[PDB]
Design a protein around this motif. Sequence first.
Motif, PDB file in Angstrom:
ATOM      1  N   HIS B  77     -13.470 -11.012 -41.826  1.00 34.74           N
ATOM      2  CA  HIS B  77     -13.677 -10.463 -43.160  1.00 34.74           C
ATOM      3  C   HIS B  77     -13.735 -11.548 -44.228  1.00 34.74           C
ATOM      4  N   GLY B  78     -14.213 -12.735 -43.872  1.00 30.96           N
ATOM      5  CA  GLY B  78     -14.443 -13.787 -44.837  1.00 30.96           C
ATOM      6  C   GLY B  78     -13.223 -14.567 -45.262  1.00 30.96           C
ATOM      7  N   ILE B  79     -12.060 -14.306 -44.673  1.00 33.92           N
ATOM      8  CA  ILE B  79     -10.836 -15.018 -45.018  1.00 33.92           C
ATOM      9  C   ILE B  79     -10.762 -16.238 -44.107  1.00 33.92           C
ATOM     10  N   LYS B  80     -11.162 -17.393 -44.628  1.00 37.24           N
ATOM     11  CA  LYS B  80     -11.224 -18.622 -43.845  1.00 37.24           C
ATOM     12  C   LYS B  80     -10.250 -19.627 -44.433  1.00 37.24           C
ATOM     13  N   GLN B  81      -9.388 -20.178 -43.586  1.00 33.54           N
ATOM     14  CA  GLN B  81      -8.351 -21.092 -44.043  1.00 33.54           C
ATOM     15  C   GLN B  81      -8.897 -22.512 -44.077  1.00 33.54           C
ATOM     16  N   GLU B  82      -8.410 -23.299 -45.043  1.00 35.93           N
ATOM     17  CA  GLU B  82      -8.849 -24.684 -45.184  1.00 35.93           C
ATOM     18  C   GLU B  82      -8.508 -25.484 -43.942  1.00 35.93           C
ATOM     19  N   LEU B  83      -7.292 -25.318 -43.456  1.00 35.85           N
ATOM     20  CA  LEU B  83      -6.814 -25.862 -42.200  1.00 35.85           C
ATOM     21  C   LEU B  83      -6.073 -24.749 -41.486  1.00 35.85           C
ATOM     22  N   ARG B  92       2.197 -29.432 -46.501  1.00 37.48           N
ATOM     23  CA  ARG B  92       2.929 -29.072 -47.708  1.00 37.48           C
ATOM     24  C   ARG B  92       4.383 -29.506 -47.631  1.00 37.48           C
ATOM     25  N   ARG B  93       4.956 -29.533 -46.428  1.00 33.95           N
ATOM     26  CA  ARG B  93       6.329 -29.994 -46.282  1.00 33.95           C
ATOM     27  C   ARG B  93       6.443 -31.487 -46.531  1.00 33.95           C
ATOM     28  N   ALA B  94       5.402 -32.249 -46.197  1.00 33.43           N
ATOM     29  CA  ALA B  94       5.429 -33.687 -46.432  1.00 33.43           C
ATOM     30  C   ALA B  94       5.270 -34.015 -47.911  1.00 33.43           C
ATOM     31  N   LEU B 145      -4.695 -35.702 -49.861  1.00 34.45           N
ATOM     32  CA  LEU B 145      -4.394 -34.305 -49.592  1.00 34.45           C
ATOM     33  C   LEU B 145      -3.455 -33.706 -50.625  1.00 34.45           C
ATOM     34  N   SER B 146      -3.384 -34.287 -51.825  1.00 35.04           N
ATOM     35  CA  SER B 146      -2.426 -33.822 -52.825  1.00 35.04           C
ATOM     36  C   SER B 146      -2.759 -32.425 -53.325  1.00 35.04           C
ATOM     37  N   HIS B 147      -4.026 -32.021 -53.241  1.00 35.09           N
ATOM     38  CA  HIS B 147      -4.412 -30.684 -53.666  1.00 35.09           C
ATOM     39  C   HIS B 147      -3.825 -29.591 -52.783  1.00 35.09           C
ATOM     40  N   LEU B 148      -3.434 -29.916 -51.552  1.00 38.90           N
ATOM     41  CA  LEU B 148      -2.918 -28.922 -50.623  1.00 38.90           C
ATOM     42  C   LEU B 148      -1.488 -28.502 -50.927  1.00 38.90           C
TER      43      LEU B 148
END
Lengths: 129, 149, 95, 99, 144
Positions: B77-83, B92-94, B145-148
Amino acid sequence: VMLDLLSNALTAIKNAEAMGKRQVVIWPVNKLIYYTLRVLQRYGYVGEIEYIDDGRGGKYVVQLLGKINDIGAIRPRFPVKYREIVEWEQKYLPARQIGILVISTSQGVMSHLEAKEKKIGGVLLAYVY
Amino acid sequence: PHRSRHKKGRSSSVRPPHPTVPTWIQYTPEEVEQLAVELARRGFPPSQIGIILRDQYGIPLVKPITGKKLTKILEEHGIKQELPEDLLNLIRRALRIRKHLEEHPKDMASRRGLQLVESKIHRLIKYYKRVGKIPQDFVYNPEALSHLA
Amino acid sequence: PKKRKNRGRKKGDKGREPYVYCDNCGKVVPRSKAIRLTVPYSPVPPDLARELEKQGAIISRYLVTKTYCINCAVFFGIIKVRPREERKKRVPLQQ
Amino acid sequence: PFSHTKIVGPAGRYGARYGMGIRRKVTTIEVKQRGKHRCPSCRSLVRLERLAFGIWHCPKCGHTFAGGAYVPQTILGKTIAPEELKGVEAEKAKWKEAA
Amino acid sequence: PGKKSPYGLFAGGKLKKKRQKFRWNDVTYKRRMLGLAEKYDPLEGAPMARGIVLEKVGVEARKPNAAVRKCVRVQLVKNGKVVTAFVPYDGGLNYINEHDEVIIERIGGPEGKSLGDIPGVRFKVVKVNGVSLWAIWRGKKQKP
RNA sequence: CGCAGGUCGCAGUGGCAAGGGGGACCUGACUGUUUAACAAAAACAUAGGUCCCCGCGAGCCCGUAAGGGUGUGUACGGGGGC
RNA sequence: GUAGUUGGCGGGUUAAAGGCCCGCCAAGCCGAAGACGGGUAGGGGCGGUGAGAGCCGCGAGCCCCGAGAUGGGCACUGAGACA
RNA sequence: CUCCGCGAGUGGUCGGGGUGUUUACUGGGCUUAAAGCGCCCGUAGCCGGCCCGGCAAGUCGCUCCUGAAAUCCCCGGGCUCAACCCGGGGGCCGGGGGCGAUACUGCCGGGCUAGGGGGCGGGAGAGGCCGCCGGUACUCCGGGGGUAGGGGCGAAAUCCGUUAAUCCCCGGAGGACCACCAGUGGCGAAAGCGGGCGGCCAGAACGCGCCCGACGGUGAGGGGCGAAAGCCGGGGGAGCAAAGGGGAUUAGAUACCCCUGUAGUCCCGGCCGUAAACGAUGCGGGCUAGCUGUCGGUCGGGCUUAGGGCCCGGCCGGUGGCGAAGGGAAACCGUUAAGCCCGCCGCCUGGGGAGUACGGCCGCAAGGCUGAAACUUAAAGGAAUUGGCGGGGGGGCACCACAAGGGGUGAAGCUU
RNA sequence: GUGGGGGGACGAGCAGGGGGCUCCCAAGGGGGGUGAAGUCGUAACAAGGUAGCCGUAGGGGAACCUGCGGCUGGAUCACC
Ligand SMILES: [Mg+2]
Ligand SMILES: [Mg+2]
Ligand SMILES: [Mg+2]
Ligand SMILES: [Mg+2]
Ligand SMILES: [Mg+2]
Ligand SMILES: [Mg+2]
Ligand SMILES: [Mg+2]
Ligand SMILES: [Mg+2]
Ligand SMILES: [Mg+2]
Ligand SMILES: [Mg+2]
Ligand SMILES: [Mg+2]
Ligand SMILES: [Mg+2]
Ligand SMILES: [Mg+2]
Ligand SMILES: [Mg+2]
Ligand SMILES: [Mg+2]
Ligand SMILES: [Mg+2]
Ligand SMILES: [Mg+2]
Ligand SMILES: [Mg+2]
Ligand SMILES: [Mg+2]
Ligand SMILES: [Mg+2]
Ligand SMILES: [Mg+2]
Ligand SMILES: [Mg+2]
Ligand SMILES: [Mg+2]
Ligand SMILES: [Mg+2]
Ligand SMILES: [Mg+2]
Ligand SMILES: [Mg+2]
Ligand SMILES: [Mg+2]
Ligand SMILES: [Mg+2]
Ligand SMILES: [Mg+2]
Ligand SMILES: [Mg+2]
Ligand SMILES: [Mg+2]
Ligand SMILES: [Mg+2]
Ligand SMILES: [Mg+2]
Ligand SMILES: [Mg+2]
Ligand SMILES: [Mg+2]
Ligand SMILES: [Mg+2]
Ligand SMILES: [Mg+2]
Ligand SMILES: [Mg+2]
Ligand SMILES: [Zn+2]
Ligand SMILES: [Zn+2]
């Protein structure tokens, strides 16, 4: 980390038999475990092999008969030729009349006696006596 | 840590051996899929989406009911994850640790926690490149990757 | 040979102990391996016939705990050298 | 560690004169003097201009202030700083204490 | 503390490297491979050597025994090294003189080192002027 | 700035202009200063080290005195030795 | 570590392919799966020893291949030698 | 003199093999005998869950072309037998060809959730970094009370004190620490972490029909963290205290005690990179009686200081004790294995020479890591037993012990 | 057929360095280690007469002493 299921299963029988247990549960399991236990049951080292169905692969419950003096899996799975099986025979077995090896040949898993009659070799699996 | 832990726990969920559709379920396979998309557009991750289905809507498992998996359902249904969701969580934890390490340069305990997390990232990148879920040139650059976060 | 499975100090699952200082001493030990005998203590012993219930004489009695090392503990009779079979028998140290 | 040297970087202008201990002291002080500092006002990581000893100037916000002889802030001087420039930390407390 | 180590079916190469690594812990193997026998032995890998007697010198037996074992100092012709050689037999030192060629040979004992109560001597005389010392001592021949 | 070819001499940075080099000991770290007119040094100075007198109405110094220098300074300082 | 070093294109030479050699172009080639450097050694059939796995080389002598003819080079003749 | 072994031989020194499971694939060991890197992240390598389909690489079976001869094994024959020679078969551990099998490994494809990772929930924790505050105690400083001692020791002395001490009261300053509660309690990979409040982080355990779908283990080389002391530069400095000063003791006393005392100890930035860095016990996984204390989570039952509380029982995960089977030279280990297994890395191969020399790398330095040999030697060493002994503990006893006594001897002359 | 000058590839040999790889000789010393017990103490073994040991720093005829941190392989498997 669990690596080889056949050695794990064969050592469970050795542990449970040495405590004089009636049965032993085995998990996890593959076809190689089943086809080995069929050869064991064919030679009277093992009672009935009931099967259970879980989500996690399945289990076997094997009735022991006190027929095992020693047991174990040969590692690594050595290739063996038909003319060589006599040499491997005296390595793991006591006496010329006692005990068997479990071989995984291209016709299926059989005892080393049934491999000698068929005149084929294969990959060694285990020894029982 | 990963190795030489003091405790080796067993906490996990014991699912039914062969899960089938619950008889009490009031949701068709189309209703179940549409519920997940609404949660997904709301912004919940695929791990948290399943908890809302079970806890709020009483859907035990989307797989037996629909025959698909949650990420596969959201993918259609078009929901595609960046990673992949696991990889994005580790990244995000890093960033939240590397942000912490800026104002606290002497947090040696946090540095080792960063090294554990930053090694968990590297294992998943090795796996995901092999199966092709991420591009073969992907590099873990913490500044890139700071945008993540 | 490893005398004592305890290692002589009931430390536990840790690496280091905070350690204390020995009264009458300073050779001392960590928090484990240190003897901590407690005695009742009271000033002016059995004068309570002529004191306390004579005049007013509100007397006080302070529980005191004393910390020692193996040298001082063996020196003051708090610790003996038990036989090997008696080493594993848990007896209180007369308070 | 340095651009073209191993250990004598800023003090490489002295060559092999004046002794290793004397030149070593120069490298220790001069690395902080010629490094990057945070301006006490704008908090930028910028190379402050030292007009004279004890006089520092921020090229970004134009802040001119008195500091150490070779470093913009001495250790003791970092504690007795004016509290007009301690406004970020003051509001940081009032955000934490109020929440 | 478990499962010796490289036991895989395709661990043949790694297994052979590990076993070769610990062969050097054996002093016998390291000496043979490094050519140490033929670099420090005065006989230089030979079973015997020639030499010239210089001075009759006497070494004392070790502490529990009491005696003066009568040896001689020899200079090897092929090397020029000087070694102390034990002259055996009762009165065997009397058949030795100064400046006579003697054939020098190992005394036996453990590992080619010294014998029982004689400290720090590795050689014994077998021939004097081209005739065996046992032959002279037994009377079967006479010294030339 | 480069490449290819040809070619002359004893000699092509052809005149002019223009480092001999290396090993080792003593000694002063070094650059610097010095007996104008017989000594340029290993002497003096030096950065660095350390000690002393001093909280300023000080300490040390100049003047007969009035007064002055250090001082439009203040111990991360002034003065005095090694 | 390597700088004719690794490869490409065009040539010379050879009985014949080849950086064998030469003119040009590129930066490649090898390496911890151990390059490079050092040490030792002619390789094999095989031989000694041990119940065997294996260890060792007495792997001198006999047979097959290699290299050499006081050290280092270069040619004649010839089917064939750098004898 | 006589006897023993072998005998045309028999001895000596060397070298190889056996010896020797002291090189361990078969087939060793690493708590204490030598031997687990101080700890961890990870590259190559090695080792890796289950099911379905394909290939047939490994692998297995047959056959072919080969693997010179000699040598080797078996069989026949010929020298008188023999050694030897001749004839035939096998092997000479391998290479390639063809045809078959697909059990296991390999590769390719599809599918799973059991190992792993990512999550959600309520709790636990001296886990870390930063900020703020406190608690007594201490030392010193100012003032008041009160005289003449204090301090210290085995005993003193040095020392402090009559410009008022020690002791008591009212105030101030400072640095370190966090008593009891408090535990074989907790957390952490190791080092390590103990007052309160707060902020930012980390890692786990438990509960779960949450997500991915083998993403895993070990890890040479490579990296990071790593007590104390010590080094570099700055700050600080209460107590303690290397070096040093003094008072004693002593044969001596450059020690043990006392007074005093400087680095150091504390904070910050960096270096060092070692320790009885120890569980002297590498990491991951599975199986194998139990009983008992305690910590965290959770579920069931019973009570409630109606509490996040308590008790009983079950599961999971830690942390101690005793102890099956089993193991061990023994001490002993024993679900927290040193048991039965499956993986991978490190290390050991008699003692001394010696953690020494040379080289290399690392370091500001101290020094560190890596690390021999000649030579010398027949033991060094583990555990346990009997004794002997102790300026270790306990009990018993004795006028050849003492206590209470009596008489003496030791001094004179003399006998011996 | 040749005789000169020269250019080319191959290439000895003689002159030189340059590096290692090795190997000897060397006034003198440097840390060591074996004898047989000569001298001075008595550091370790018993609570070895100041529990012992590990790392590090300082000091001292010497064994060794002291400071800090650690260990029990301690002379304690034992508080209330
Ligand atoms: Mg990997
Ligand atoms: Mg420790
Ligand atoms: Mg001997
Ligand atoms: Mg001129
Ligand atoms: Mg000068
Ligand atoms: Mg000059
Ligand atoms: Mg002049
Ligand atoms: Mg002049
Ligand atoms: Mg001068
Ligand atoms: Mg100087
Ligand atoms: Mg002077
Ligand atoms: Mg051609
Ligand atoms: Mg070439
Ligand atoms: Mg011949
Ligand atoms: Mg030649
Ligand atoms: Mg010739
Ligand atoms: Mg062994
Ligand atoms: Mg360890
Ligand atoms: Mg080491
Ligand atoms: Mg790893
Ligand atoms: Mg095949
Ligand atoms: Mg034949
Ligand atoms: Mg043949
Ligand atoms: Mg490593
Ligand atoms: Mg320290
Ligand atoms: Mg003091
Ligand atoms: Mg001080
Ligand atoms: Mg260890
Ligand atoms: Mg053992
Ligand atoms: Mg036990
Ligand atoms: Mg070493
Ligand atoms: Mg060195
Ligand atoms: Mg006894
Ligand atoms: Mg009496
Ligand atoms: Mg008398
Ligand atoms: Mg002593
Ligand atoms: Mg001293
Ligand atoms: Mg002192
Ligand atoms: Zn004490
Ligand atoms: Zn600014």
